Structure formats: C-alpha cells, structure tokens
Design a protein around this ligand. Structure first.
Ligand SMILES: COc1cc(-c2ccc3c(c2)NC(=O)/C3=C\c2ccc[nH]2)ccc1O
Length: 268
C-alpha cells in the first residue's frame, strides 16, 4: 500500500514495465516530491550493468529540459534512482488519438525537445529512444527529455564514435538503423524528434517502421502527402518534416538548420 525509501514515502507507481518500477516518492516531512526508479538488478548480465551507464550519464546531465538526476543508492540488488518529478505526466497523454494537439503547443514542446536535445548532443550524449513516453511535462508544463536507460556517449575527447548497436523503438527509429552497419549518432535523434513532431500534429504514427517495404513509408518517400497523417498537418510544419524525415542520414536536416526553418520561427 504505502512503502518508503530511506526517509522518503512511496506514494504511487508513476510507471512500471519489465524494467522494474518507478514509484513517486515524496516525504511528508519536507514534502518535496521526487521520482524514484527502483532498478531491480538480476545476475550480472542485464540489469546490474544497463544501469551503471545509466547513472553515469545522469551525473553529467544538467539542463532545464532533462529530468534532473538527484542521486542514487544501492541496497544490493534493488538500486534507487533519485529523479526529478514532473507532475504534468507524459507528452504522450497530451496527444489526442488521431487528432493531436493545437499547433502552438506542438511548436512549444518541440522547441524544448530541440533545446534539451541540442544540449545533450553538445556534451556528446545521444538518447536513442526519443518518443512521447519519454518526454515528460512538469507543473508549469515544460518538456523534459526522460528515461536515459538506452542513452550512450558518441563523442569523447572531440572524436566521434559512429554507432552500430540497434536499439530504440521501431515506429521512431531512423531508417539507417535498418539498412546500415554503422551510423552517426545525432541524425538518429533528429529523425526520432521528427517522428515525434508528427504525432503531436496528426495524433498518429506514420508507419510501424522506416522499412523500405512498409507501404506507408514508401508513400511518404513518394511525396504522397495527400494522405494521412500528412493531411492533418499544415504545409508549413509539414515543410520541416519534409526536411527531417529525410532518408539519407547525410542529407537530413541538422538541428542547427531546424532552428532556421520557417515554421519553427513562426509566431504562433
Ligand atoms: C533522467 O533520466 C531518467 C528519468 C526517469 C523517469 C521516468 C518516469 C518519470 C520520471 C523520471 N519522472 C516522472 O515524474 C515520471 C513519470 C510520471 C508519470 C506521470 C507523471 N510522471 C527514469 C530513468 C532515467 O535514467
């Protein structure tokens, strides 16, 4: 019913999953509310390490658009991830199925996702799994990238480190992850942010995966915007998508150039 972790009361479960569980921890004494991820390590082959990297990354991260990392403890098997609480919930729950959200709100949330992403990239960290379920909104309703379990460093000592490990989520991963062996880390996140811009604007996921065979992806590759979800989207913001969901990860628009897009700088 009502458990607790080292002086903090465990109110309710914010999220779960085969990952373990994240209960909202708050202490009636100070009453500061926080997010506590309880990674239930097992053996020395899955959880007991997929978290060593996760905690390190966090201690590096500090940006108004990245769920803050307070600290961590560790009984033995059960480890505690002290994290920032975002009352707002997930961006995911602000997308109306098959409809979306008011364009101005899409633009705003996109600015922050771009803010937080550019930031991470600056310190050579790639998220690898950007999506509405990982973009939380807080009290004031500010977007904060979340869940760094799959993140990783791609630039250390100013030297890129091409990636090859496949991972993330199918209806959000960039095409190169399927056709290539190695791929630059940054363009994968830009593509994933692009797919997130579409949900916010069409309340639906373009395709199940950027597979050259997925019929819906082939139709976007054939400028057939005269169909869903592209039809529910306005040509302005659609112009940016045309530059984001670009196949060759080399010709894809770069975060910097996204800040110079007409829709992006459109007072809304
Ligand atoms: C900074 O990096 C991380 C964030 C979270 C995380 C995951 C879920 C929530 C949260 C933080 N803070 C919250 O407030 C969360 C969930 C929620 C659900 C409804 C309101 N909030 C888990 C692992 C991480 O490595």
């Amino acid at each position: 019913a009502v458990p607790f972790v080292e002086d903090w009361d465990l109110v309710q479960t914010l999220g779960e999953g085969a990952y373990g569980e994240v209960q909202l921890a708050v202490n009636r004494v100070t009453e500061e509310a926080v997010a506590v991820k309880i990674v239930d390590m097992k053996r020395a082959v899955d959880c007991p390490e997929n978290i060593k990297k996760e905690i390190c990354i966090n201690k590096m991260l500090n940006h108004e658009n990245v769920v803050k990392f307070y600290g961590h403890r560790r009984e033995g098997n059960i480890q505690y991830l002290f994290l920032e609480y975002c009352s707002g919930g997930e961006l995911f729950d602000r997308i109306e199925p098959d409809i979306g959200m008011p364009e101005p709100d899409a633009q705003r949330f996109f600015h922050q996702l771009m803010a937080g992403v550019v930031y991470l990239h600056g310190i050579g960290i790639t998220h690898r799994d950007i999506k509405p379920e990982n973009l939380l909104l807080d009290e004031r309703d500010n977007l904060k990238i979340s869940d760094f379990g799959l993140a990783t460093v791609f630039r250390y000592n100013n030297r890129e480190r091409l990636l090859n490990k496949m991972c993330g989520t199918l209806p959000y991963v960039a095409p190169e992850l399927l056709k290539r062996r190695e791929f630059h880390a940054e363009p994968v996140d830009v593509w994933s942010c692009g797919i997130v811009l579409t949900a916010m604007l069409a309340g639906e996921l373009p395709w199940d995966q950027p597979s050259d065979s997925c019929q819906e992806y082939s139709d976007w590759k054939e400028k057939k915007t005269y169909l869903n979800p592209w039809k529910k989207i306005d040509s302005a913001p659609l112009a940016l998508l045309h530059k984001i969901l670009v196949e060759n990860p080399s010709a894809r628009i770069t975060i910097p150039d996204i800040k110079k897009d007409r829709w992006y700088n459109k007072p809304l």
